[PDB]
């Protein structure tokens, strides 16, 4: 076994209870599948192996997987019908992370989403499907990544605003579609669409939520998100449900669309309980994150949990002034080494694509979000007093900047164990697309008059 | 083709799929749908465009659900038809139970259940075998998030916090697997969750207060708090490295306005270390509730054990806690 791999990633935890239950059976099985891969001795792994004993990111294999994922699927994939906009987003996002220019997809993105847009507003999974905030989020982020005036023009912004206004609920949250469930996905996806399209803050004059005294899309919203924190410190999908990393991401990213992280996050969340629960998502020896207490690691949480960290770290550090002298940072409060080992040693499939965990086939969702998390560990992401937005509402959200956190040498508690050859493009921690793509779409829309 | 040949469907023309292919550049991530699904969905487009509330449309939604239960639009249209036609929702629930038993991790089936069960005209009280059906689901996946979310809604809707099957079903799940955090989370709702029907639902009391006080109960039932803490200790002793009951006990103490130091001796009993949670508990007791005499140093020692031996992947968070305690102690020495 390679000398650059610490014992922490080569052995199960020291403490082991005698009692066996289904939870410990599945945890033990997962550890035992990950150990040969962490050690770099499994025959499915391709090198080169770096000085820390970790295989390279298999860039060419993943590029081919993601390009293939944009083409046609057989009938057996019918359950993905509602998710077609997601499949476009996950593939474009993975290609962008890996350094491709996805400009050449503009026309095919336009073709795809023109058909999925409803004349009453919003985007659904495809022709004849009602609008849904997740498909609208995926489509807007896809349009942002390909760019260009023609793609930006496809969206009916006024009708999107009217439709999103229908989703606003009396309790401050959002349903995901008319007649659908209310949870923090609804809030985060609706507010990202609202922000990137520079929609008016006021609710449409006919929005039902106005009958309950609400006036704007954000009225009652951070209070609703505060009511999704749980006794464990994490954040659930809806009030009283179980704390989960995917819903913590949605809630914290949505709070950071409302003001500066160091104002909004401590006001609406108890950081004293949030921080240890977020820290406790990461396991050894696997190195990755689980979504909830006593469940298993999964490479997609490299994004949902991993990208909570720049948001919480900004809430603790505050806004960085471009002029002022560099301020102190709390730094990274999780193990970048562990996450990087889990993604590169355990989540790469030899034929291309990344996966949840050893033993699972890849898919483009896991490929996108494992790459997104690997990118996060490679950058300092922080918010500043310099925004690309001309307006106040979401000003902090458009102030995020990035510096590389370069590959390290030596042992240490906060180190970069990828190689620079594994470096991916930085993604915005709230919008989950490149910063320039988020900037360009927001600024374009800011400069368009709102439709009559 | 089944719909196009059926005279039941003769009075309506289907709307053909337009996916944008041969209306421009080729679309992305297309699916080569079966002929049956293409035909059914083309009839669904037509009925929904006409806002048709009919028995044939209802049967069509069931057919499409059999092919693709993740089609969110068809479930919402189904519920519209059921209410518009005054269908028997007891019979709808018995059909939905079969769909639920066939398909896991699905937002629509459990959202649809809540849409139906929320109708007080049809379900004025908790149906007599509804809790048993949820236990049929938990026997197959005891941590199914959407079924637990539905059960939290069911408890609030029918005011079941003190219903004995809610606690008994949580206790049966915790007997089978004491590490089932979903069951611990539901236990917290039953015992400590807010119940005021005039407030919006919340996971914790006191969300209008300062965030450090989130969870504090307005009125504390001290004997209930003692009982829940004793229950937690008994479960911890079965498997001391299980995080869930330690986190539940922290939540109970926060709700009750009681300090972590109530469990100082219990935590010390595990420390030769049988529980990393006991070490973290001690770090907090010495850091935050002890204002004495080398208590800061002892907190730092506990955090050092965590960072070096007992939970080393979280080293950067333990070191952040050491920095906070060291700054706090420096501030104390300074005044």
């Amino acid at each position: 076994v390679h000398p650059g791999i610490p014992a922490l990633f080569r052995e199960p935890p020291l403490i082991h209870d005698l009692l066996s239950t289904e939870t410990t059976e599945l945890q033990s099985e997962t550890v035992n599948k990950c150990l040969p891969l962490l050690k770099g001795i499994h025959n499915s792994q391709k090198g080169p192996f770096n000085k820390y004993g970790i295989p390279a990111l298999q860039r060419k294999d993943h590029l081919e997987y993601l390009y293939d994922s944009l083409e046609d699927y057989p009938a057996s994939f019918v359950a993905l019908d509602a998710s077609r906009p997601w499949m476009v987003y996950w593939a474009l996002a993975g290609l962008c992370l890996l350094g491709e220019d996805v400009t050449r997809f503009r026309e095919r993105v336009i073709s795809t989403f023109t058909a999925a847009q409803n004349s009453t507003g919003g985007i659904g999974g495809g022709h004849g499907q009602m609008s849904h905030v997740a498909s609208s989020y995926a489509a807007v982020l896809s349009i942002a990544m390909v760019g260009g005036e023609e793609a930006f023009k496809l969206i009916d912004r006024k009708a999107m605003w009217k439709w999103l206004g229908k989703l606003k609920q009396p309790d401050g949250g959002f349903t995901v579609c008319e007649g659908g469930e209310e949870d923090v996905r609804g809030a985060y996806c609706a507010m990202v669409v609202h922000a990137l399209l520079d929609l008016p803050l006021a609710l449409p004059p006919e929005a039902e939520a106005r009958q309950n005294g609400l006036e704007t899309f954000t009225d009652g919203l951070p209070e609703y998100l505060s009511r999704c924190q749980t006794y464990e410190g994490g954040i659930s999908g809806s009030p009283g449900s179980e704390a989960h990393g995917a819903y913590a991401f949605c809630a914290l990213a949505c709070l950071c669309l409302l003001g500066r992280p160091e104002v909004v996050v401590p006001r609406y969340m108890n950081i004293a309980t949030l921080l240890p629960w977020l820290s406790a998502r990461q396991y050894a020896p696997e190195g990755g994150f689980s979504g909830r207490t006593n469940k298993l690691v999964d490479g997609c949480y490299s994004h949902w949990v991993g990208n909570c960290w720049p948001l919480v770290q900004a809430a603790l550090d505050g806004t960085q002034p471009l002029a002022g002298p560099k301020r102190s940072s709390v730094g990274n409060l999780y193990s970048r080494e562990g996450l990087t080992r889990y993604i590169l040693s355990c989540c790469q499939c030899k034929l291309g694509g990344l996966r949840d965990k050893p033993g699972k086939h890849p898919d483009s969702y896991h490929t996108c979000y494992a790459l997104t998390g690997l990118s996060t560990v490679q950058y300092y992401h922080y918010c500043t007093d310099s925004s690309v937005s001309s307006k106040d509402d979401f000003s902090s959200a458009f102030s995020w900047k990035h510096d590389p956190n370069f590959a390290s040498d030596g042992q240490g508690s906060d180190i970069g164990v990828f190689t620079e050859n594994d470096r991916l493009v930085p993604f915005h921690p709230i919008f989950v697309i490149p910063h320039k793509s988020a900037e360009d779409i927001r600024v374009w829309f800011e400069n368009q008059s709102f439709d009559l | 083709g089944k719909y196009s040949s059926d005279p039941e469907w003769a009075s309506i023309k289907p709307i053909e799929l337009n996916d944008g292919s041969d209306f421009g550049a080729m679309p992305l991530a297309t699916i080569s749908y079966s002929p049956e699904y293409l035909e059914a969905t083309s009839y669904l487009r037509a009925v929904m465009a006409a806002n048709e509330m009919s028995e044939r449309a209802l049967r069509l939604t069931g057919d499409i659900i059999s092919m693709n239960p993740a089609h969110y639009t068809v479930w919402i249209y189904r519920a519209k038809i059921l209410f518009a036609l005054g269908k028997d929702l007891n019979e709808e629930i018995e059909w939905l139970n079969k769909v639920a038993l066939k398909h896991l991790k699905n937002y629509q089936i459990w959202h649809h259940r809540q849409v139906l069960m929320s109708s007080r005209a049809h379900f004025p009280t908790l149906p007599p075998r509804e809790q048993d059906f949820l236990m049929e689901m938990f026997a197959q996946d005891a941590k199914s998030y959407h079924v637990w979310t539905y059960r939290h809604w069911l408890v609030r809707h029918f005011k079941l916090w003190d219903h004995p099957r809610e606690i008994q079903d949580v206790e049966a799940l915790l007997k089978a697997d004491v590490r089932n955090n979903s069951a611990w989370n539901h236990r917290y709702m039953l015992r400590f969750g807010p119940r005021d029907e005039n407030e919006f639902d919340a996971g914790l009391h006191n969300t209008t207060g300062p965030s450090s006080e989130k969870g504090r109960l307005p009125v504390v039932d001290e004997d209930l708090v003692d009982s829940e803490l004793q229950y937690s200790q008994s479960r911890i002793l079965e498997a001391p490295e299980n995080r869930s009951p330690w986190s539940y006990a922290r939540g109970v103490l926060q709700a009750a306005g009681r300090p972590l130091s109530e469990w100082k001796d219990f935590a010390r009993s595990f420390v030769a270390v049988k529980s990393s949670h006991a070490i973290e508990w001690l770090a907090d007791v010495y850091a935050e509730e002890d204002g004495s005499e080398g208590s800061a140093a002892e907190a730092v020692k506990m955090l050092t054990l965590l960072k070096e031996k007992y939970d080393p992947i979280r080293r950067n968070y333990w070191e952040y806690r050491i920095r906070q305690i060291t700054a706090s102690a420096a501030h104390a020495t300074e005044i």
């Binding site: 996905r185 999964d298 896991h366 | 993740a70 699905n106 937002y107």
Partner: peptide, 5 residues
């Protein structure tokens, strides 16, 4: 298997 909608 992960599901988001």
């Amino acid at each position: 298997k992960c599901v988001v909608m």
